[PDB]
């Protein structure tokens with residue numbers, strides 16, 4: 001008979017703060033604010049004086 | 051032991067710059083989120099209407115995100131919709147009987 | 149957003165709940181995101197009553213008027229971006245209202261392009277109230293519409 005169109009939806013998504021809402025259930029996300037560091041001085045390519 | 055006044059000046063400056071960038075970061079992401087959902091909803095229109103301008107003389111419409119027809123054809127039709135390569139002209143003279 | 153209609157029983161400006169409150173909530177969210185508090189406390193870095201240092205007062209005034217030109221450019225750009233966005237999200241649910249009407253009356257239809265309607269028949273206010281219910285149906289005399 002017919003077709004439909006659509007998109008993709010993950011069953012457990014991420015909530016982002018848009019411009020006119022708070023907590024919008026979005027499929028995917030990234031994280032502009034990196035919280036996890038490497039707790040050492042990554043110093044290859046330099047001569048490094050502790 | 052940083053100096054008391056200029057440390058307050060730097061903290062006035064940094065927390066301003068912190069309030070500058072964090073307002074910018076909150077505004078940017080919320081602008082980009084609204085823009086990403088704008089450029090996610092946009093090519094619904096760019097997909098769904100470029101389908102509707104091809105089946106158009108068969109058509110009535112329901113408005114779900116979907117299709118209707120006058121006839122029944124096989125999967126050679128619906129695979130060609132994804133090829134952007136559908137054609138109609140061969141029995142419009144029978145569609146007025148439908 | 150609203151409606152207005154013309155038939156044999158009367159006329160008069162209707163209204164609709166669905167996309168209205170959607171429009172008011174998106175700007176209220178746009179309000180409450182922006183109508184909000186800067187949580188960071190800004191201290192007092194320069195004096196008002198006696199004798200701040202000449203160079204660092206010029207530095208603070210260079211910094212503050214930069215930051216003033218930073219935020220006022222941002223405030224002018226933000227509001228003008230949000231104004232253009234608000235009129236974008238005001239004009240958007242014209243399309244979201246007006247075409248979800250046109251994909252229901254569609255086999256009756258020709259079109260004029262005013263923001264309005266056309267028909268093959270004449271029915272009462274049971275039709276036009278159901279347009280605001282999103283609950284219109286057509287299928288019962290398409291076999292007579294080809295005669296029209």
Ligand SMILES: *[C@@H]1O[C@H](CO)[C@@H](O)[C@H](O)[C@H]1NC(C)=O
Pocket residue numbers: 010028029030
């Ligand atoms: C979402 O983005 C991440 C990147 O961190 C990627 O690994 C993943 O495949 C993407 N898609 C889904 C459905 O999670």
Ligand SMILES: *[C@@H]1O[C@H](CO)[C@@H](O)[C@H](O)[C@H]1NC(C)=O
Pocket residue numbers: 052053054056057058061
């Ligand atoms: C500046 O702020 C930091 C934390 O934001 C604080 O540790 C420091 O003591 C402050 N310095 C002055 C001079 O207020």
Ligand SMILES: *[C@@H]1O[C@H](CO)[C@@H](O)[C@H](O)[C@H]1NC(C)=O
Pocket residue numbers: 126127129130133
């Ligand atoms: C669709 O595209 C494929 C490859 O692009 C082609 O082999 C095929 O003939 C096209 N048409 C249909 C009806 O599948």
Ligand SMILES: *[C@@H]1O[C@H](CO)[C@@H](O)[C@H](O)[C@H]1NC(C)=O
Pocket residue numbers: 200201202204205206209
């Ligand atoms: C800094 O600017 C204010 C007004 O913007 C002025 O009253 C004050 O005298 C200025 N201070 C210096 C050191 O230029």
Ligand SMILES: *[C@@H]1O[C@H](CO)[C@@H](O)[C@H](O)[C@H]1NC(C)=O
Pocket residue numbers: 274275277278281
């Ligand atoms: C419209 O909605 C109201 C309440 O939601 C309902 O009572 C009514 O039957 C519906 N249909 C029409 C044609 O008014």
